[PDB]
Amino acid sequence: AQQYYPRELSILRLQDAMKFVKELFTVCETVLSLNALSRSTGVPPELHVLLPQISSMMKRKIVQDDILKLLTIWSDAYVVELNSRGELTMNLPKRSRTLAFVERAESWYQQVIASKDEIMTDVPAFKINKR
């Protein structure tokens, strides 16, 4: 076109992905914080239990891969634990987190579009290995 060629179009796609993971982080923050209060151990239910809550707040069906995008931006954002059956459980780490995430999200976005190759259109899911 005039202003936007394939590379620029990919950047625009990525910006929507940035907007997505930023909102998703905030939603995970409210859900995990609230659910971590329900039990004496301070440990929330498995992630698959909390996904309907996360989905309703996001007004869209959120899956585990969406959640893992957050760790790509901030690896120490949450603590990841795999149980006996391999079911994923996420939890807040032991001590503003929202501001910290946005800064890293911005910095991550900067480094992606900075170099002149091919631009990814979405945040890749963080890779989790077996315990």
Numbering used by the authors: 294 to 388, 398 to 433
Show the paper's wording.
Further division of the C terminus of Cdt1 showed that fragments containing amino acid residues 271–496 and 495–604 interacted with both Mcm2 and 6, suggesting there are multiple interactions between Cdt1 and MCM subunits. In summary, Cdt1 makes extensive contacts with the outer perimeter of MCM, notably being sandwiched between the A and AAA+ domains of Mcm2.
The process of eukaryotic DNA replication begins during G1 phase with the loading of the minichromosome maintenance (MCM) heterohexamer comprising Mcm2–7 subunits into head-to-head double hexamers with double-stranded DNA passing through the length of a long central channel. In budding yeast, Cdt1 forms a stable complex with MCM before loading. We propose that Cdt1 stabilizes a conformation of the MCM ring in which the Mcm2–5 gate is held open to allow duplex DNA passage required for helicase loading. To understand Cdt1–MCM at an atomic level, we determined crystal structures of two non-overlapping fragments of S. cerevisiae Cdt1 spanning amino acid residues 1–438 and 495–604.
